[PDB]
């Protein structure tokens, strides 16, 4: 989904912050 | 030994032999 | 109700296209020596579209892989040869989702009718215009109206002496 | 309602492009010796797009791996040879997600009509301009209008004596 | 051109007052291996020549 890809990029940002 | 990685549902799992 | 608003929208668009044509056609042909009218076929249908595109991965050079199992067996005894290749591949593909909401009130097809006057010299003889000047008027009107071929726009400019 | 706001937006954009053209065309051709009008085909459609790109990993040199199992067997008795290679590879791939929300009100196709006057010397004879000057005017108008070929912009500049 | 009063015209219009709603679905063909997008592929090949 478009919103699904939005969620994927959001989880990538989450990984960035966690690191 | 190393079962190939399945990213989604369509991806086919590793076949043993 | 809404139909009247749409009709007024069409009238304003047509009037502004008419004024834009008249603005450039005035300095060379002269005030009142040019008349133009515009009709517009508009788009008042609400459309929503979602597009999904997958990049092809049939070529091994552009294919992105996550897991690959390649079992190869060759029991040579061509004789009693025995070849066996079991290949399993999981791919990751490029994906592009486009969501589009078309604007309500867009122009579908514009047709414009322009009429020019003759040229009355100091004597008063209504001398008609020339082919080059007519071509220039056609080009200017095409530029002003936003002429396009995908829309299906039609333009007609004719030369005739105006009545009293 | 919203259609009128969009139309006023288009009118302001067209007027500002017209003024920008007139500003540079004034010092050389002269005040009033140049008239230009602009029409703009705009984009009032809300679009949202998400793009996913995977870097290819088919070449072993750029392939990133997490786990790899390579079972190799060669029972030589070509004779009664027996080769067997079971290879399992798990890869990690580069990933790029781009989320784009296109602006509402962008320009799709701009067509501009410009008309210049003749040159009346001290005697008063309306001497037409030259080819080099016409080319200079065309280049200046292309620069002012932001002429581009991807959009599909069309420009037409013609020379003709202005009416009284 | 013709003059005031030297022209008369009347228009009749057949209009559309029927509410229509339409949903369209289109699939790009993938029968050619060059434009076919794949997620998983298993190809077992065996040749026992005697």
From Swiss-Prot, chain A:
Subcellular location as annotated: Bacterial flagellum basal body
Domain of life, source organism: Bacteria
Signal peptide stretch: none
Assigned protein family: Belongs to the FliE family.
Protein name, as recorded: Flagellar hook-basal body complex protein FliE
Species per Swiss-Prot/TrEMBL record: Salmonella typhimurium (strain LT2 / SGSC1412 / ATCC 700720)
Gene assigned in the entry: fliE
UniProtKB/Swiss-Prot annotation, chain B:
Gene knockout outcome: Defects in flagellar assembly process.
Subcellular compartments: Bacterial flagellum basal body
Top-level division of the source organism's lineage: Bacteria
Primary role: Structural component of flagellum, the bacterial motility apparatus. Part of the rod structure of flagellar basal body.
Quaternary structure annotation from Swiss-Prot or TrEMBL: The basal body constitutes a major portion of the flagellar organelle and consists of a number of rings mounted on a central rod. In Gram-negative bacteria, at least four rings, L, P, S and M are present, whereas Gram-positive bacteria lack the L and P rings. The rod consists of about 26 subunits of FlgG in the distal portion, and FlgB, FlgC and FlgF build up the proximal portion of the rod with about 6 subunits each.
Family stated for the protein in its record: Belongs to the flagella basal body rod proteins family.
Protein name: Flagellar basal body rod protein FlgB
Curated annotation (Swiss-Prot), chains C, D:
Polar residues: compositionally biased ranges: 79-91
Inducing stimuli: Inhibited in nutrient-poor medium.
Role played: The M ring may be actively involved in energy transduction.
Included stretch of the parent chain: 229 to 439 of 560
Provenance organism: Salmonella typhimurium (strain LT2 / SGSC1412 / ATCC 700720)
Name of this chain's protein: Flagellar M-ring protein
Domain of life according to the entry: Bacteria
Location in the cell: Cell inner membrane; Bacterial flagellum basal body
Quaternary structure and interacting proteins, as annotated: The basal body constitutes a major portion of the flagellar organelle and consists of four rings (L,P,S, and M) mounted on a central rod. The M ring is integral to the inner membrane of the cell and may be connected to the flagellar rod via the S ring. The S (supramembrane ring) lies just distal to the M ring. The L and P rings lie in the outer membrane and the periplasmic space, respectively.
Family recorded in the similarity comment: Belongs to the FliF family.
